[PDB]
C-alpha cells in the first residue's frame, strides 16, 4: 500500500493516477468506489483492509513568469499557477 | 441587472486531447499549431474580461 503520495492506482481493475488520503465518506456494503458528477472517480475502497479512501488527481497547473522588460533588466521572477508551495520543488 | 464578468477558463489542450500519452502527444504535433492558437485565444478572453 501507498498513502499520501502521487502514485497510480488500479484497485479492482479501473485505472488512475493521483494521491490517496483518508476519507470521511461512509459507503454501503455493496459499494465499491465513489464516482463524482461528470463521471469521474473520486473515492475507492481498499479491497484488503475494507477501508474507503479519497482520490485527488495530480496537482497540474500552468507555469507563468513576470518580467519588467528585456531592455529594463535581465532579472525575472516566476509564478506557479494554483499549486500549493509544499510540493513545488518536484519541478526538476 | 447587468452581467459584467464570467469565470475565465484556460485548458491544457495537450492534456485534454492526448491524455498524457507519449506517442499520442508526438502524433498531435503533426497537426500544426491549433494547440497554441486555442490557448492564446482563451488567455485573450481572460485578460479582456
Amino acid at each position: 500500500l501507498v498513502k499520501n503520495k502521487c502514485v497510480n492506482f488500479n484497485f479492482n481493475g479501473l485505472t488512475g493516477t493521483g494521491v490517496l488520503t483518508e476519507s470521511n465518506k461512509k459507503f454501503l456494503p455493496f459499494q465499491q468506489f465513489g464516482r463524482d458528477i461528470a463521471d469521474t472517480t473520486d473515492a475507492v475502497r481498499d479491497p484488503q483492509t475494507l477501508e474507503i479512501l479519497d482520490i485527488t488527481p495530480c496537482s497540474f497547473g500552468g507555469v507563468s513568469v513576470i518580467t519588467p522588460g528585456t531592455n529594463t533588466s535581465n532579472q525575472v521572477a516566476v509564478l506557479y499557477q494554483d499549486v500549493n508551495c509544499t510540493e513545488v520543488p518536484v519541478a526538476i | 441587472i447587468l452581467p459584467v464578468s464570467m469565470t475565465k477558463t484556460s485548458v491544457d489542450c495537450t492534456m485534454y486531447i492526448c491524455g498524457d500519452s507519449t506517442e499520442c502527444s508526438n502524433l498531435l504535433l503533426q497537426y500544426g499549431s491549433f494547440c497554441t492558437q486555442l490557448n492564446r485565444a482563451l488567455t485573450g478572453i481572460a485578460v479582456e474580461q
Binding site: 488527481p57 497540474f60 500552468g62 494554483d82 | 475565465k8 477558463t9 484556460s10 485548458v11
Partner: peptide
C-alpha cells in the same frame, strides 16, 4: 450574494482567480 449559488479542477481543466476580489470590488 446569499441568493446566488449554483466547479473544481478535473483532468487538465483550469480556473483562474479574478483580478479584483469581492472585498476590493
Amino acid at each position: 450574494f446569499n441568493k446566488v449559488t449554483l466547479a473544481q479542477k478535473f483532468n487538465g481543466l483550469t480556473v483562474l482567480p479574478p483580478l479584483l476580489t469581492d472585498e476590493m470590488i
